[PDB]
Design a protein around this ligand. Sequence first.
Ligand code: ZN
Lengths: 437, 565, 188, 91, 186
Amino acid sequence: KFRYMPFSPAGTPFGFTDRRYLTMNEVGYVSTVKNSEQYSITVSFFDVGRFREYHFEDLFGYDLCFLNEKGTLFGQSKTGQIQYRPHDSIHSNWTKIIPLQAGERITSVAATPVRVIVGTSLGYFRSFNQFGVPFAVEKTSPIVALTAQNYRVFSVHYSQFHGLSYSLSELGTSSKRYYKRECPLPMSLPNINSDMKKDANLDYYNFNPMGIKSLFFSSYGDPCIFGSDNTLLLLSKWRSPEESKWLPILDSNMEIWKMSGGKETTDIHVWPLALAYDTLNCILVKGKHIWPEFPLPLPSEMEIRMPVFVKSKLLEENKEEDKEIQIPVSMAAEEEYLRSKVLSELLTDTLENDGEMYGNENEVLAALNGAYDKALLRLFASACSDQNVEKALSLAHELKQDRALTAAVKISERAELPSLVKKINNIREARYEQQLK
Amino acid sequence: MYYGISQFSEAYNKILRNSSSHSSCQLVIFVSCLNIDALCATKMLSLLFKKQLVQSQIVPIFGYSELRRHYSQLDDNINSLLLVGFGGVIDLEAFLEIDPQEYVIDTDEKSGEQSFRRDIYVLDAHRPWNLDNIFGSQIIQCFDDGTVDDTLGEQKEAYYKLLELDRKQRKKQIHEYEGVLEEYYSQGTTVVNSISAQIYSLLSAIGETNLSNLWLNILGTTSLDIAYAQVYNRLYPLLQDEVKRLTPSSRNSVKTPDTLTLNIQPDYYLFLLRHSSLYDSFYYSNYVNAKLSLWNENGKKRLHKMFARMGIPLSTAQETWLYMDHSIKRELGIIFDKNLDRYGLQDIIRDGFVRTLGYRGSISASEFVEALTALLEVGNNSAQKLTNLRKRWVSNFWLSWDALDDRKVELLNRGIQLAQDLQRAIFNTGVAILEKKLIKHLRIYRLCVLQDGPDLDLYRNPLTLLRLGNWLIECCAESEDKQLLPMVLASIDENTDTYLVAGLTPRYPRGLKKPILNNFSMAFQQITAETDAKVRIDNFESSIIEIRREDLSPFLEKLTLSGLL
Amino acid sequence: SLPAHLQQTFSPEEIQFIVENEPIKIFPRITTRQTRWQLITTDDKALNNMVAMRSTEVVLWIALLLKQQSKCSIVAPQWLTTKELDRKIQYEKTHPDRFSELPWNWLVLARILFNKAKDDFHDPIHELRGKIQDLREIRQIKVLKGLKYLNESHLQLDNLSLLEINELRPFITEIMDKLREIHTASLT
Amino acid sequence: NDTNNLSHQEQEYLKEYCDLITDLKSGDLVDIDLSGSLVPPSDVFIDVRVLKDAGEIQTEYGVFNLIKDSQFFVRQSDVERLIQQGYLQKI
Amino acid sequence: DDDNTEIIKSFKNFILEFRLDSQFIYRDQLRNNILVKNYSLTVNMEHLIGYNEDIYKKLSDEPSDIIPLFETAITQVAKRISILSLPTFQLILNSNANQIPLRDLDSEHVSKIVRLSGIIISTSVLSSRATYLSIMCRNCRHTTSITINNFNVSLPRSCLSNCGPDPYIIIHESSKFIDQQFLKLQ
Ligand SMILES: [Zn+2]
């Protein structure tokens, strides 16, 4: 049966040892070691130019931790004791102890540049400024996870009596705004496997009874989460509630299956870190325990791809021993067109609302549009070679540039389809009129 | 001027900033040879600066006499200078040929802080601090652990008030502050901290901690245990935390040719246990000689008797410890628990640090420091000969520096081979001193003078002389319960016709509460200031002096007549 | 004028210098993207446009120059892994005359990266050091068989590394030259 | 760019060839030191130890004071000539 | 039966893996010896002890039995590093254990490794010992062979292919031999 527990982004259990990771993100990670009745904590950064790695001793046994590029926040789930540490020396650290009801415990904590947030098993929400001045208290579903990027904050909530849900908000200093409040979440649960399989990974489920492996904002503020099924999900169109939707953008298991030559190397596990545009930052872990250890192994990089393939069909198409399986060009072109379309739309929405950060992202969008038409031309040519004029004509509507339509005319000539040459030229003339208008 | 623990970081920052230019050698390090802690300290610093690409020069120095010489010749563009292991006891602005008006660049109108063209940094564990250096100076910059603000309230007050004061009230106030300062000054000399330890805190601050720096920390620290046990005991727990912190996960995995480990396990106050043999380990131990009186046969038979009762065949106890049988090696840790009590010898058991690298076998820090000191001692008209001797002793600094590198274990083995011979030769002199009863028991202190020997040249180096003194001190500490006394030890040289003299304190047994202080400093200084005698004082350690053959007896006569002992 | 040991051949130092001009993939720990590097024998854009933890490609000598300090990490080449080296040893055993198709700089690059970049591998280094040795030993057997075909006309070699050629150069060329002299003297 | 074993024609020959070398080394192509080192540059910075007491000396990069058995951490491009002359060792 | 294979496997893995810094010193020595047609290996005790003390313990307890196993392990490695025939290789040892004076050797030391020193006073001429040896069976005229090794044997009497009480004779025409020499130490 379910029970409430604390969480922090991508921590590890102690396992057999006296040390563990508390949390990880793109900026860095935090670790701690137990020394009889005391603990030692160490904070690490990947930008070694901008920050200093450092360490200090904890007597109170913190079990909660949250990191950003301004400071680190620490908490104790039973005692209610908390501490915030800026990365500069100038603003000295400060501490507080929060009231708790009998058996109540803190489940998660998070912080913006000016806001501090605490949640509990009994569904109480409390908030303070960067100097601990209390602002407000609210009663909600029990919270299980929290994350933030500048003023944008993303929350997850769960109850036996209300289901699984999420919230999205923006703590603007001009004003605070809610985009979603405890709306239903479609995430894949792990409980059936935990109850039936008896896999001796039970310690991980004790450590993380929700099985939510990690969650973070993209490099452009999109909300993202990695499921217990080892799939990456991203929320699209969040700015428009009648169009907002959840998208499955990468399955790790399918990648390892292809990488192994179509084999079941279950000894390999993927530990996610952060999402950089189109590429996942992750650790590839091997052996008994599905999470990394010390000293930290080097990260890896991996691209997202749409779920379109089938194992049996690809085995049939395929049919040195570990060679990665060969794929039909139709699947590759189809997947590219879908991936190009989704990427372009997300980038377009980002530019439409938040603009360019660097001054060149429009060029990437142009490249995506070129890739999109290129993929469609290959699929179109396949339809023409099959002499399916109806399907080829339907595909021709989706092409953007007249360069591509001209190429489609040449392709139709090679296919010896003058009817399709005619109808494409009708479309080109119609679209030329629309361009003249 | 001085900085504290809360800002050592800032001096390091200032030094980086201050010594920036690549057109010149903008940073210089002066280091005292014949000091292990100083050596490890310096090594740490050089690595630090290496990483930062700071062009610099390292110069080893013997004493005050050479200090002046080296300082004199310095270039004007030398923005930063470091004094490592000396100078905290003396007025440096007085000693050096300094006018501050010759070194001020800029005066900060706001702070009143004077920016000097050359900054002089001091790292020294010795106490008491010279007040002029701390309170007085603007060029001199000392690093202190808190001893200054913990200790020096009355003194700070007195210094400043005495300075500011320049009829009943005036007389009373000046006599008061003269009293304060005179009470502070002319105390005994003492060592209160580890150089390398302080450095390690800075490395901690910055974030430069690793096993290569922690091991140097341990080595530096460990050199204190023989003479300054109290200090060592204060420091020790910190080391355990660090060793437990930096040791990796997945412990007790299978070996590889690349695997390095550092771990806490038993160590024994036995002279170089993992080299030579078990029997030699007991026989030459400095503690065992005081506990069982090995200078005579009624002592040696006790050792034979012990091995017979312990169940170790005496012909195997003399085998080389690497080749000794595996079963005895693993059973030894329990055999000692059953047998050392009957000989009053339980203090042999303790914990220490051991390091191993690949397949080449273990070594403990306690053994390592003996190898390094041996290399310092024996590595390979009157003024010219003294210069040649003091120059030879400086080459051994580099013969020891190059042995701190894992790529050069070949040199470390040579160091160990020399250490064994040094202890052998020391023991063969100690027995002669005791059996001929050359110790003279004067009322105030104990006197001993070596007029001849099998080869008396070995005692011409200060470190060897101190090893012999530390042998005799353990013997005197355990031979009777009564009369903890100062001791004076001297050795003649046939080329100079001068006696090399050292003044040594007593100390309390290992197993037993403020520390005592060495008072020979002020006594030798006062007799030197008074005396007709031809004498020399230029060593960093002021408890060691030199005097001509005919002048030893009048000097010692004036010394014993003095109330300063 | 030029030294006697450099009349006909390259020393191993020059071989290392030649190998150092190749490109390599790195992860930087700092961002340079908005002084500038202004190099004259390479591209300059890559170093001026680095972003932290974004993969990029640079010449090997600059990569080692950065890795001397905290600012960089080096990605190992894909052939330098246990799986690939296993397959190459199996190829070597299977085909008793052909040489396996390892890159021309494999020895030099392995013995550079094991010294300068021991921390950045994924495989345990004490296994790679064994498999590199196995490859070199098998190739030496195959070389010793081949020196029985020195002749008056020519020889063909395939996939033999630069350092391996340079090791053998003064022997092969000298003996071959003397066989040529003996043969042509009988024609004239 | 000592003499007793050379014949006098050889004694003038050597002087003539030295004049030729310095003529090539001067003028155009002066930027590359034709009489310099032929071993490829391995490292920028090195540690060098002081072998002979030549006292204080001048060099194009600056001034050095060669206190016997002191050690420098310095760029190789500077001290290459002093290593060749034999005042220094690389350690 | 299995112990003979585990011990050989252990010494085989010793030669293939002992690095000190970056050179596999025993693989290199074994290869460099074969090129000059020297079939032997000079192992050092301290390296064996450093690698694994248990192997040295086995060697120290029963040297007459274990030295042949290590010698055949050397042969098995020698083939891998040089063939895509060789004799059995000779093992040679170096040690720094305490010297025993020659006058103190006694009944406590029988079948132990001993290190000593002295002056050579006499040398014999060379003589021949057998290693691989071929046999003919007098009655049935069947044939077989035997492999000797020189550690502390006689012709067998289990007749094969009744075949008789003592039917075996030696074919010197198809057998292999080695050199042996005697010395005196004072
Ligand atoms: Zn028969």
